[PDB]
Amino acid sequence: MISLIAALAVDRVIGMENAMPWNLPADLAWFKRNTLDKPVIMGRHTWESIGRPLPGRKNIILSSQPGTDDRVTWVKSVDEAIAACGDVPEIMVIGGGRVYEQFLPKAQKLYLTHIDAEVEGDTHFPDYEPDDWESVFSEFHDADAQNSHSYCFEILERR
Ligand SMILES: CN(Cc1cnc2nc(N)nc(N)c2n1)c1ccc(C(=O)N[C@@H](CCC(=O)O)C(=O)O)cc1
Secondary structure (H helix, E strand, O other): OOOEEEEEOOOHHEEOOOOOOOOHHHHHHHHHHOOOOEEEEEEHHHHHHHHHOOOOOEEEOOOOOOOOHHHHHHOHHHHHHHHHEEEEOOOOEEOOHHHHHHHHOOOOOOEEEEOOOOOOOEEEEOOOHHHHHEEEEEEEEEEOOOOOEEEEEEEEEEO
């Protein structure tokens, strides 16, 4: 099964041209904990912004163009991305917007970080219907000396 993992601000904003104006080490620890040892599928832009292969995981980058880093796996389509994952318990799709859009319809689980932040952005997580998902886990956190905003981690299973 396929899972999508994303950090969302108000209005489902997930990205913009510049760096997001927040500091959330807690979300990154959560992202790492949930993706370690699993294949992670990302779009070329996310790859670019991550900047290096993520350690301890099989990195698969979607691009219409030839790959420029032999350390990772480049694919030209959804289906190839999937086949490149092999026979594994769970595949993690890490972004970005165009990628989430194509994978949502095939995902069985959502790992979301809701951030209490109003940011202007040009990329959004796709619209999803709460009633199609069962919130199986949730945990609210206030901002602290390390985290600039309050956030909440939620795990949804498709009904
Ligand atoms: C920009 N980007 C994509 C990114 C960032 N936060 C997200 N947060 C969530 N919840 N979900 C995503 N898909 C997500 N994606 C990044 C940037 C850096 C690292 C990164 O260094 N992660 C290390 C963790 C490093 C650290 O813990 O500081 C890892 O090992 O996963 C990951 C994703």
